[PDB]
Amino acid sequence: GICKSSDCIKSAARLIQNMDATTEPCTDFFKYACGGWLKRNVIPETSSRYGNFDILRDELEVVLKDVLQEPKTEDIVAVQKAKALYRSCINESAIDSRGGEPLLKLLPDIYGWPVATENWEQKYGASWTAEKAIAQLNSKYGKKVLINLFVGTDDKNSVNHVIHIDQPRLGLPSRDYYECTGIYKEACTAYVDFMISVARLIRQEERLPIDENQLALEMNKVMELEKEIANATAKPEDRNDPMLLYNKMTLAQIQNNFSLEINGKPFSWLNFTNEIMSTVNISITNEEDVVVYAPEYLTKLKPILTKYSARDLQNLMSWRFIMDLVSSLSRTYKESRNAFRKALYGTTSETATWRRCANYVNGNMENAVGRLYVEAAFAGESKHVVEDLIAQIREVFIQTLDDLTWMDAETKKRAEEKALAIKERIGYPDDIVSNDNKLNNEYLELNYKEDEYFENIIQNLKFSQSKQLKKLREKVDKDEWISGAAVVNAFYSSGRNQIVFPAGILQPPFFSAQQSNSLNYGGIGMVIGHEITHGFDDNGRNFNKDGDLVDWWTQQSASNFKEQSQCMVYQYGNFSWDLAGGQHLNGINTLGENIADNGGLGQAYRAYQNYIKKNGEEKLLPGLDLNHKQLFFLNFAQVWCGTYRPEYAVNSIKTDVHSPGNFRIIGTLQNSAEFSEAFHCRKNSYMNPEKKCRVW
Ligand SMILES: SC[C@@H](Cc1ccccc1)c1nc2c[nH+]ccc2[nH]1
Ligand SMILES: *[C@@H]1O[C@H](CO)[C@@H](O)[C@H](O)[C@H]1NC(C)=O
Ligand SMILES: *[C@@H]1O[C@H](CO)[C@@H](O)[C@H](O)[C@H]1NC(C)=O
Ligand SMILES: *[C@@H]1O[C@H](CO)[C@@H](O)[C@H](O)[C@H]1NC(C)=O
Ligand SMILES: [Zn+2]
């Protein structure tokens, strides 16, 4: 009783070609499940990571290029904009002819780039101050330097917005890089050379005189500034407790508890905060409430700042925006990035311009692009089947609450509470197809010119930032999706207490109404449990049914969670990762994702078990000597057939909240008794340790 459908033939062939049945599943299940993929595939030059998951994202791009590249008479305005933005984006000759000019037009208006100016002090240092300068970059261009102010949702009341202050992101991927030795040396060297190179082009294009030594002089000074700011930022592992993280102040407290002396002042938080909010005609009292994520960093900032010029400061501040612009300029500007992105990413070339451009438009017009994607590529009934799967898996989670010995009764009850309260977002929002007005109106204020890509993307930064800040006194809309449809991913929002599964992830190998349920439950089913479980991981457990940051745990149950979850900190902490040169994974920074994998997979199996009990076994797949319990786990693993470039592995072992795909397979299956029953694994086989972690 082999299935011999078209769709069964496709499924089986993919499973076969990926796997290496030469390998004992119980010795190394990633090798087993993925061995044939590993043999046949080399990472593309434009890829920092490649794998089945990334391939889906490459395939989604092909769809986007098809729906963006050809004007259609009936196209509503919203989509004409997307396509026009697309067209402005793929015209390189237009862009190459403008050189850097579009940036030079731009410089004066963020207070300059001193290293690339004459008499910066005469021109600006007058007008200059750090209030005014940090605030420009932030409110006009959304670039967050020195101090990150951001209108956001309020962790303690999910219907409101607040102003946040947090530590900024850095020009290198993580604070660790600023060690600048060993595995980090090239990066630091490439980074400053890239500074240097960009500032030389501008001086040249300005026809200014070029003194290499002073360039190095000033760009090294920028680096040692950023080094200090790096050392002053808190680690991820010390940022992971949302109750620790949430400290609400008035500007008043802030001004009196977190003083800064920049240049010679010192710093007017009130002034700073109004230069930003001013940008949207809103008024801020020194009595305004602010959520402060990074108190210690602010503290630490004081002595640092007092030590550098306005020139030094602005040289870092402007470069952190310029950084991001130069690949939207001509080829010579493009080129100066070459060695820096190689150092961070290991890639030797830019991705295709049409793909970059397809993704950028998706980024900036996600509902419009998403309408098109769904029309071309998304069936419409996938989404009913997924709705029902989500009901199944949510029920299973609830069930398991009874068999979990490390919570107390009341705590279980609240856990069921919060779970009943999860609200699910599947595929796309019908609005974006049925309601033309609403889609046109989201982009009303935008007007693109097909020969001015750089103007266009400037405008999108302004619009974006205008939008966000004006939410301050507005409620949160509970209609709002937190992802477009044309995205290969899924999401949990603890503020919305909501799970989202875009059209883009609802395809093989994760999902098809035509593929075997075993494949479904091991793919998208595992994914739905992942997302649910995040509501109850080491961040999400802190948020309640309404998305509010408030404790609903007993001290005992909370402490047991920490204890149970500690097992995963150690297990994963202990993997060493060849591609990153033998470093251990960070067990703390991945914990949330690892909890979500182990809970999510177990949930999904039990939901497959529950399915088979009710509907009976499935017909087997042709060409494969495996039953469906076995297939369930095959497919789980094959989602993550993939590899990394060493450079990116070094980047990602610090920056990714996920474990690398291979250790996710191995991580979770070692903790799963079901798996080892599937493949008759000996006690103490590599895949089957006697000691096993469990939380959800
Ligand atoms: S946090 C959502 C999760 C969704 C997911 C869970 C389980 C299996 C596949 C995807 C996920 N998205 C990713 C994006 N990049 C790398 C790893 C990722 N993991
Ligand atoms: C590229 O942009 C320039 C604008 O100067 C235009 O003349 C040229 O025809 C454009 N090419 C395409 C294919 O649209
Ligand atoms: C902020 O303070 C500066 C100091 O020069 C002042 O010029 C500016 O008008 C002030 N703006 C706001 C929003 O208070
Ligand atoms: C490996 O597990 C052991 C035993 O708990 C633990 O002491 C050690 O810290 C773990 N390794 C890492 C790097 O976390
Ligand atoms: Zn996740």
Side-chain angles (χ1 to χ4, degrees), residues 91 93-94 450-451:
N91 201 321
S93 43
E450 294 204 26
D451 60 324

Side-chain angles (χ1 to χ4, degrees), residues 550-579:
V550 75
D551 183 353
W552 48 263
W553 290 73
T554 72
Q555 284 141 51
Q556 197 55 234
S557 279
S559 143
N560 295 343
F561 181 91
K562 280 135 153 223
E563 175 181 313
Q564 304 289 143
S565 59
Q566 209 56 210
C567 181
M568 286 171 183
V569 178
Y570 291 151
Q571 169 194 20
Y572 284 80
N574 266 267
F575 300 129
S576 52
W577 190 11
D578 53 348
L579 285 174

Side-chain angles (χ1 to χ4, degrees), residues 107-129 132 203 206 208 311 314:
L107 257 359
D109 183 49
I110 55 176
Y111 284 105
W113 200 25
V115 55
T117 337
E118 42 217 347
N119 307 294
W120 182 83
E121 289 78 357
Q122 210 250 317
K123 318 182 176 257
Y124 305 95
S127 31
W128 199 92
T129 73
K132 277 219 263 109
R203 296 201 110 235
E206 272 307 22
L208 307 202
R311 161 166 212 109
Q314 187 61 52

Side-chain angles (χ1 to χ4, degrees), residues 376-491:
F378 192 58
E381 267 224 329
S382 281
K383 133 172 221 252
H384 293 93
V385 169
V386 161
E387 274 158 17
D388 168 72
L389 297 175
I390 285 183
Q392 272 160 60
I393 280 111
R394 178 212 310 261
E395 181 41 45
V396 167
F397 175 94
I398 299 166
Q399 281 185 353
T400 297
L401 287 182
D402 302 22
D403 285 289
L404 299 194
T405 56
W406 53 264
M407 309 189 67
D408 54 34
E410 29 187 306
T411 287
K412 286 179 185 194
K413 166 176 324 207
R414 260 134 167 182
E416 153 167 11
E417 234 156 89
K418 158 146 182 167
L420 292 158
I422 307 195
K423 255 241 295 197
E424 77 239 84
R425 302 291 214 199
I426 308 154
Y428 61 98
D430 246 85
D431 259 8
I432 67 169
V433 176
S434 62
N435 195 337
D436 280 358
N437 269 156
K438 165 167 195 192
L439 189 292
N440 289 324
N441 278 342
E442 190 187 339
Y443 306 112
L444 235 214
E445 235 134 0
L446 296 164
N447 186 246
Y448 292 139
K449 298 193 293 197
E450 294 204 26
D451 60 324
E452 295 305 344
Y453 175 65
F454 197 91
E455 287 60 24
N456 290 155
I457 79 188
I458 301 304
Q459 182 189 157
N460 281 355
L461 291 169
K462 292 192 165 132
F463 191 78
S464 204
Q465 195 67 6
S466 252
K467 212 224 235 22
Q468 187 51 20
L469 358 224
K470 100 183 342 22
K471 285 157 145 209
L472 184 56
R473 310 294 202 224
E474 278 309 312
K475 281 219 200 108
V476 197
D477 175 354
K478 313 164 98 104
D479 281 352
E480 229 197 88
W481 281 53
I482 69 163
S483 176
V487 174
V488 175
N489 215 334
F491 304 87

Side-chain angles (χ1 to χ4, degrees), residues 53-124:
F53 191 77
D54 292 306
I55 289 175
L56 285 209
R57 275 169 185 184
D58 283 347
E59 289 178 353
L60 183 124
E61 284 160 9
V62 165
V63 178
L64 295 189
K65 143 192 219 285
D66 280 14
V67 306
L68 291 165
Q69 65 186 351
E70 253 191 74
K72 267 206 147 107
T73 274
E74 69 65 42
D75 278 353
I76 56 156
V77 168
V79 145
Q80 302 172 42
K81 308 219 167 121
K83 298 198 183 168
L85 185 55
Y86 184 70
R87 286 192 313 265
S88 97
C89 183
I90 78 200
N91 201 321
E92 298 192 17
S93 43
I95 285 156
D96 274 342
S97 60
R98 284 157 80 61
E101 148 75 28
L103 209 266
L104 310 164
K105 262 153 112 153
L106 178 13
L107 257 359
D109 183 49
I110 55 176
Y111 284 105
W113 200 25
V115 55
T117 337
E118 42 217 347
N119 307 294
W120 182 83
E121 289 78 357
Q122 210 250 317
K123 318 182 176 257
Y124 305 95

Side-chain angles (χ1 to χ4, degrees), residues 530-531 534 593 596 658:
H530 183 80
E531 289 314 320
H534 276 299
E593 292 298 336
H658 315 79

